Coordinates of C-alpha atoms and ligand atoms in Angstrom, one line a residue:
X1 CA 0.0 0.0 0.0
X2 CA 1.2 3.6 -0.7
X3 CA 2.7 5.4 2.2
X4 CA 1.3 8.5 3.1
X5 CA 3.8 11.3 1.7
X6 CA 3.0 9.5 -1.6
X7 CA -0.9 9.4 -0.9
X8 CA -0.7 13.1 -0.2
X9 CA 2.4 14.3 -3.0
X10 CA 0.8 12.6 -5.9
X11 CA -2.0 15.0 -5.5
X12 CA 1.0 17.7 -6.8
X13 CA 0.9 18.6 -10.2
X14 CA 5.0 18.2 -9.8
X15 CA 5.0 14.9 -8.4
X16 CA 8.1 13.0 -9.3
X17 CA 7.5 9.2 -8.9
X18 CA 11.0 8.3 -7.3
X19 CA 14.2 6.0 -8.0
X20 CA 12.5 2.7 -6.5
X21 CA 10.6 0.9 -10.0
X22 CA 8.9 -1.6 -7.8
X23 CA 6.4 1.0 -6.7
X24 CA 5.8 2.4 -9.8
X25 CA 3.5 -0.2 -10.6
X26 CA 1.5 0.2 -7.4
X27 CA 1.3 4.1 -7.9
X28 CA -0.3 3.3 -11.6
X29 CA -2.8 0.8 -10.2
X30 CA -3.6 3.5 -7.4
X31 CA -4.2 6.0 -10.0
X32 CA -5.9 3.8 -12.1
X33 CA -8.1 2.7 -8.9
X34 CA -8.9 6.6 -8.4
X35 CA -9.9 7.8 -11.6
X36 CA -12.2 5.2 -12.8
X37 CA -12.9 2.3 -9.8
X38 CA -11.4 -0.8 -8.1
X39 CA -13.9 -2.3 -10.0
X40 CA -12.5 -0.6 -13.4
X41 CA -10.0 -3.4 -14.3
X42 CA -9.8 -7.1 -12.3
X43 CA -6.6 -6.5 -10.6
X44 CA -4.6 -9.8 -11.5
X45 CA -5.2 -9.0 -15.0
X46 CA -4.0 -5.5 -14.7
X47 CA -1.1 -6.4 -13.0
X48 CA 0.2 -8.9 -15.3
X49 CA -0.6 -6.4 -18.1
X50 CA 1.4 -3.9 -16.0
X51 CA 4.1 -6.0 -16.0
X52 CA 4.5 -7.1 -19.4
X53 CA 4.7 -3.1 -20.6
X54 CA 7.5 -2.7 -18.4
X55 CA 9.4 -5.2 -19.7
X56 CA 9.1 -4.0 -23.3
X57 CA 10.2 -0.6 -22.0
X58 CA 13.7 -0.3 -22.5
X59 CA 16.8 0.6 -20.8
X60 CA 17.9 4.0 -22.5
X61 CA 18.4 7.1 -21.0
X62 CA 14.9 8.9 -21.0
X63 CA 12.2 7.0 -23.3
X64 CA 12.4 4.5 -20.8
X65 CA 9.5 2.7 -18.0
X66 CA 9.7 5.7 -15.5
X67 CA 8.7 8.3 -18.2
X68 CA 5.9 6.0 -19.2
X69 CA 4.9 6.2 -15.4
X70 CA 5.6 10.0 -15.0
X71 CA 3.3 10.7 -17.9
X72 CA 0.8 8.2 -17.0
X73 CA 0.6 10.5 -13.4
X74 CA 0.5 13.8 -15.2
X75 CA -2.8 12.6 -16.8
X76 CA -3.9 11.4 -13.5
X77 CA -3.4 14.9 -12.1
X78 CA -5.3 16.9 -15.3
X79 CA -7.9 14.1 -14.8
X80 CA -8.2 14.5 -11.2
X81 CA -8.8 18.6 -11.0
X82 CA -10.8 18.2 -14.3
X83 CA -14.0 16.1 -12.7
X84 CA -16.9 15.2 -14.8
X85 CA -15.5 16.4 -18.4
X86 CA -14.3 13.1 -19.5
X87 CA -16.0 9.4 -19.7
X88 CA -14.7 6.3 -17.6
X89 CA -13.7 5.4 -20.9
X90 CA -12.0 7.7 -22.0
X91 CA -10.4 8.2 -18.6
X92 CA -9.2 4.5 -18.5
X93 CA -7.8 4.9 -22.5
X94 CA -6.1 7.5 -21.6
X95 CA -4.1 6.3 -18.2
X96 CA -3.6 3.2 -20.3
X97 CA -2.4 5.3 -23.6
X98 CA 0.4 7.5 -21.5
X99 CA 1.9 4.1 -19.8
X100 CA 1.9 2.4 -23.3
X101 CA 2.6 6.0 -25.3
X102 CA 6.7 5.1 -25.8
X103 CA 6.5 1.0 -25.5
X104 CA 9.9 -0.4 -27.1
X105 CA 11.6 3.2 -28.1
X106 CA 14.5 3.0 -29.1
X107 CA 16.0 6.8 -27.9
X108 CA 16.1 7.5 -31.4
X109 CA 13.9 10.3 -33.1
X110 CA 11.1 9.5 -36.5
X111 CA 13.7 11.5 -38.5
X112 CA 16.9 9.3 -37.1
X113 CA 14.6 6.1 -38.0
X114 CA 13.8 7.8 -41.6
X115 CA 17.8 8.1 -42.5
X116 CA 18.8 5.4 -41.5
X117 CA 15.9 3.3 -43.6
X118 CA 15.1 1.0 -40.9
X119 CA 12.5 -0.9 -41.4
X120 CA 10.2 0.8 -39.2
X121 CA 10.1 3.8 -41.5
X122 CA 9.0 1.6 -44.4
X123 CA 6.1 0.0 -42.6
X124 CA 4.9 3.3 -41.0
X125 CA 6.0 6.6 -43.0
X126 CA 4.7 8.9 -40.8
X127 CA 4.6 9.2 -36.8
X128 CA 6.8 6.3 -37.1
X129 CA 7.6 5.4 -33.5
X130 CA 4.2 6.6 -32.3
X131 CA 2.4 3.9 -34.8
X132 CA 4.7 1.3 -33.1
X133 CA 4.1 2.0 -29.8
X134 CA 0.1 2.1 -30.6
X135 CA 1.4 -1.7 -32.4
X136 CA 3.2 -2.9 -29.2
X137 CA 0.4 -1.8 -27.0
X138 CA -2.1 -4.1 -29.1
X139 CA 0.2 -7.1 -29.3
X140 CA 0.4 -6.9 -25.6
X141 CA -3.6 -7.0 -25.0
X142 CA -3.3 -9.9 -27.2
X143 CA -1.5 -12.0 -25.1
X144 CA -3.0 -15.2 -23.0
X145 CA -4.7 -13.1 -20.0
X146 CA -3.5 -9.9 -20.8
X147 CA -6.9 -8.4 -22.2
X148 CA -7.8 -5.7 -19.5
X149 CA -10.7 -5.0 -21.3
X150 CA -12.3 -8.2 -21.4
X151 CA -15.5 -7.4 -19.9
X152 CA -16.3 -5.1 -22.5
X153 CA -18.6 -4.9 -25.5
X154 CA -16.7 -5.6 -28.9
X155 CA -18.0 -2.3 -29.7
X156 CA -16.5 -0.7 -26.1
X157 CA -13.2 -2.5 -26.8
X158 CA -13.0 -1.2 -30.7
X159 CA -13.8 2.6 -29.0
X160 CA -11.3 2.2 -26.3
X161 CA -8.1 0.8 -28.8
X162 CA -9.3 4.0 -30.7
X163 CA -8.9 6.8 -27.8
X164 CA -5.7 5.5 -27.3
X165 CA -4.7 5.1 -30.7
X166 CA -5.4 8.9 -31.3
X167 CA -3.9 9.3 -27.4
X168 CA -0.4 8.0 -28.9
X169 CA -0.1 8.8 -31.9
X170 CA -0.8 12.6 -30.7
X171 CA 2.5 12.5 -28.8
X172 CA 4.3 12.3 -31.8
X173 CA 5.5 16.3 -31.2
X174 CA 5.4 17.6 -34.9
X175 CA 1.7 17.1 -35.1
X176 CA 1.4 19.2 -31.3
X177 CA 1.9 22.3 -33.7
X178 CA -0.9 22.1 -35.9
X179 CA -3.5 20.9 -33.7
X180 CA -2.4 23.4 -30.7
X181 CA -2.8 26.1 -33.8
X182 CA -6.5 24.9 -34.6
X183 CA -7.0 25.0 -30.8
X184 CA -6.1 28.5 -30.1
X185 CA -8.3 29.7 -33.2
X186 CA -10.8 27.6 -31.8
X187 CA -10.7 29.4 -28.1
X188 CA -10.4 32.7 -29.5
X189 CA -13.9 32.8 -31.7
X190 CA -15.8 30.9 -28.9
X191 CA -16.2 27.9 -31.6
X192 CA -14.8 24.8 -29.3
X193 CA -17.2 22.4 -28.7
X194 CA -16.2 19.6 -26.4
X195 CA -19.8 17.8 -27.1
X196 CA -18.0 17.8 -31.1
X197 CA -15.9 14.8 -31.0
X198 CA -13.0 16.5 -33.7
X199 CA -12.8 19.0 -30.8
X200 CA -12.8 16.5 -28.2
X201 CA -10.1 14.1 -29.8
X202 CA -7.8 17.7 -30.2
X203 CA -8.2 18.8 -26.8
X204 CA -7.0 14.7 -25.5
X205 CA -4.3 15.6 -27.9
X206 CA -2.9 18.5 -26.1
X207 CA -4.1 16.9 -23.0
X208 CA -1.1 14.4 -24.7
X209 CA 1.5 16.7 -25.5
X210 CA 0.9 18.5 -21.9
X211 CA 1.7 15.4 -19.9
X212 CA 4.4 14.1 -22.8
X213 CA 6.4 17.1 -22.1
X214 CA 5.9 17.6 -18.4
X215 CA 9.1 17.3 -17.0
X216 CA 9.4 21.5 -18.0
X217 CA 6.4 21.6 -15.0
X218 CA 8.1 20.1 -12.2
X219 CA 10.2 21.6 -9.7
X220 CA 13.9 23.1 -11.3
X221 CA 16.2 20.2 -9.9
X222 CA 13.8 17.8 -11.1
X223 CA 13.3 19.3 -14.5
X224 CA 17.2 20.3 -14.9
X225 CA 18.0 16.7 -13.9
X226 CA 15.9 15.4 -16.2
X227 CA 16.7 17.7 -19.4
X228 CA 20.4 15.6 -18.7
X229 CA 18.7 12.2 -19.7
X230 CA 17.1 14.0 -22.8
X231 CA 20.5 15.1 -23.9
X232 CA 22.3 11.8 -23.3
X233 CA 19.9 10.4 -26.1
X234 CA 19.6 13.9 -28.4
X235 CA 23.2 13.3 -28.5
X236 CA 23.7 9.6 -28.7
X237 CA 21.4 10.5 -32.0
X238 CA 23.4 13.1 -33.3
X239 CA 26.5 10.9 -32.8
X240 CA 24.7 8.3 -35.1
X241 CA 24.1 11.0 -37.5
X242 CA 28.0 11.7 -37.6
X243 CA 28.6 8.2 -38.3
X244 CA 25.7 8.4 -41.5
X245 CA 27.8 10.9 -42.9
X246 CA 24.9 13.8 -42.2
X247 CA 25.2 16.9 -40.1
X248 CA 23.3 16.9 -36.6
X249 CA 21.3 19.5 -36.0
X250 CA 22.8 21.7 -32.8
X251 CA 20.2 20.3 -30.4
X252 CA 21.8 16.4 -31.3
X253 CA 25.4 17.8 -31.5
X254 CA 27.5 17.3 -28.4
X255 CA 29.8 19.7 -29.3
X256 CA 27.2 22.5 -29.3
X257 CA 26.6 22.1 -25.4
X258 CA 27.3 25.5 -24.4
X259 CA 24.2 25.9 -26.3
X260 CA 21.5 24.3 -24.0
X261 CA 20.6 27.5 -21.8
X262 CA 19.8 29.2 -25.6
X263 CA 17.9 26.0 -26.9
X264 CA 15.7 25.8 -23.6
X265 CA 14.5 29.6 -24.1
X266 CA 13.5 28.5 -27.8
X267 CA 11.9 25.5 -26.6
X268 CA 9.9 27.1 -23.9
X269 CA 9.0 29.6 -26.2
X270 CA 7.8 27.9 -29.0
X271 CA 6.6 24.8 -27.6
X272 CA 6.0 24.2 -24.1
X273 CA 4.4 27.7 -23.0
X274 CA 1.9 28.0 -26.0
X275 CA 1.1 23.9 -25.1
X276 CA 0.1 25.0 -21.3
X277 CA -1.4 28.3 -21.8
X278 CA -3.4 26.7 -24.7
X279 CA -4.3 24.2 -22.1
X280 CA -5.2 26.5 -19.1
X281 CA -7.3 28.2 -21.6
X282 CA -9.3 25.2 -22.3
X283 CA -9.2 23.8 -18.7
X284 CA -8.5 26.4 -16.2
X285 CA -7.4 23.7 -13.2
X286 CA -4.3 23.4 -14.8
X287 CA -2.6 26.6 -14.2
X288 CA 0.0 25.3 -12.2
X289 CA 1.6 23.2 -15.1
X290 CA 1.4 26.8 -16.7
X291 CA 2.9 28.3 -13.6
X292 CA 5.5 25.8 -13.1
X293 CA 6.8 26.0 -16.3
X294 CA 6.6 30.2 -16.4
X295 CA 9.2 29.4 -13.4
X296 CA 11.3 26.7 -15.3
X297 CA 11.9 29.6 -18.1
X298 CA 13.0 32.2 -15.8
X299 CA 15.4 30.1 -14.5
X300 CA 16.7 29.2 -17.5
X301 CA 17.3 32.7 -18.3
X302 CA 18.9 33.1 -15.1
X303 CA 21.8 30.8 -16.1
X304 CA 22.2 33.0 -19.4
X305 CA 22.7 36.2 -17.5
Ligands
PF6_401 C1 21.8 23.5 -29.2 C2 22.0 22.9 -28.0 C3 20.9 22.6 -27.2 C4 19.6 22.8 -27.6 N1 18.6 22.5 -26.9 C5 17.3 22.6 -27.3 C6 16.3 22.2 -26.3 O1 15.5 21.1 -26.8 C7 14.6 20.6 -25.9 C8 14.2 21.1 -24.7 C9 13.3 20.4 -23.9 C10 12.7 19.2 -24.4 C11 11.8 18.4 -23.6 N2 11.8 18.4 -22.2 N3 10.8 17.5 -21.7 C12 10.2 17.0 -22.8 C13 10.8 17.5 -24.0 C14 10.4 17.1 -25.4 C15 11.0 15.9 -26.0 C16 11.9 15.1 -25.3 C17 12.4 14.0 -26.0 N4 12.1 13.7 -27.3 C18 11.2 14.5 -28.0 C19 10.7 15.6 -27.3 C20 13.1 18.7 -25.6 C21 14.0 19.4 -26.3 C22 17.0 23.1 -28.5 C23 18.1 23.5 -29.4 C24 19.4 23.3 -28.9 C25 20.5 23.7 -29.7
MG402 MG1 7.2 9.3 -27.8
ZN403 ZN1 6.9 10.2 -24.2

């Protein structure tokens, strides 16, 4: 059972889920127990589902089981202060989705996969990764006692695979900028509609991106310790693209280091501010991922001065 600081800290918007993996598990099925029901999923099942998505996590730097687990909470949280907006369905999907969002990445980008060929990139031309992770989280449900959703209605089951289908395939960053554009234009002439189901699947989306990126909402040491692990695979990449013969691009290029403080400003800028102001916009209760990372860019722009 959880002990209390967690029962109580989890509650936080900047939660950070700890070194110790074998309570991640138990702070998913916690989660999952709170936003849906302990009679949401039977609990052996789950468990043994649990169990076989960490293992098809890998052991790289940052796309790895405790991001999984970290985004998984995020949701929890934006589900949590968000009451009655979103189905049990949609609320299981989606806690399901963010643990499953990454399954077998490699720490290697779409555009990495593209020039190199690998097969992946053949198969699934666009949102590579994202359509393989959406892959792996099928071909685990179809394992002997893994089906979580068992108890459902064929026609349930097709709708759930579906939310999370558009849940990870949303991730996939390059699509965050059109959608977040749309979203904005939609919040600005009074036209969203979250009874419209385009609208709807959008604002998940975001929802998405939000928790994909929220290591830039926790507290600074947590987010400046984890911007390390996103380097150690940005540059692992860039390395690889060395070794193709093709120029990195500064973020992937070790040797442009010194860089970082500049490259979190543009980031920050471009990316994750208009994502959580977009967001508080659209659900007010989660201002302090908007706060949070407001704080994270000033302090960025402290190390520059
Ligand atoms: C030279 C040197 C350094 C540079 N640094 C950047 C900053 O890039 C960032 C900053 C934050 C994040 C991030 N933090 N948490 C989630 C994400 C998003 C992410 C993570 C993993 N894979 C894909 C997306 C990603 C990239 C940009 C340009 C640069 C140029
Ligand atoms: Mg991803
Ligand atoms: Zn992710």
């Amino acid at each position: 059972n959880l002990p209390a600081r967690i029962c109580r800290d989890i509650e936080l918007f900047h939660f950070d889920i700890g070194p110790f993996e074998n309570m991640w598990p138990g702070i998913f099925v916690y989660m999952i127990h709170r936003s849906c029901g302990t009679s949401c999923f039977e609990l052996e099942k789950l468990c043994r589902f649990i169990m076989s998505v960490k293992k098809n996590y890998r052991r790289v730097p940052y796309h790895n089981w405790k991001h999984a687990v970290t985004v998984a909470h995020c949701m929890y949280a934006i589900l949590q202060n968000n009451n009655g907006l979103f189905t049990d369905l949609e609320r299981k999907g989606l806690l399901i989705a963010c643990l499953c969002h990454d399954l077998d990445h490699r720490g290697f980008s779409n555009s990495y996969l593209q020039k190199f060929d690998h097969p992946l990139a053949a198969l699934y031309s666009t949102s590579t990764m994202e359509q393989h992770h959406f892959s792996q989280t099928v071909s685990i449900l179809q394992l002997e006692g893994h089906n979580i959703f068992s108890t459902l209605s064929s026609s349930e089951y097709e709708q759930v695979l579906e939310i999370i289908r558009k849940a990870i395939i949303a991730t996939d960053l390059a699509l965050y900028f059109g959608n977040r554009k749309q979203l904005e234009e939609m919040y600005q002439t009074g036209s969203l509609n979250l009874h419209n189901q385009s609208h709807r699947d959008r604002v998940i989306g975001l929802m998405m991106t939000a928790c994909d990126l929220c290591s830039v909402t926790k507290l600074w040491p947590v987010t400046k310790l984890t911007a390390n692990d996103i380097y150690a695979e940005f540059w692992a990449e860039g390395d690889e693209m060395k070794k193709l013969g093709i120029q990195p691009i500064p973020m992937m290029d070790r040797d442009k280091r010194d860089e970082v403080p500049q490259g979190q400003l543009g980031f920050y800028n471009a990316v994750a501010i208009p994502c959580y102001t977009t967001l508080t916009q659209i659900l007010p209760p989660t201002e302090p991922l908007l706060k949070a990372c407001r704080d994270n860019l000033n302090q960025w722009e402290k190390v520059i001065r």
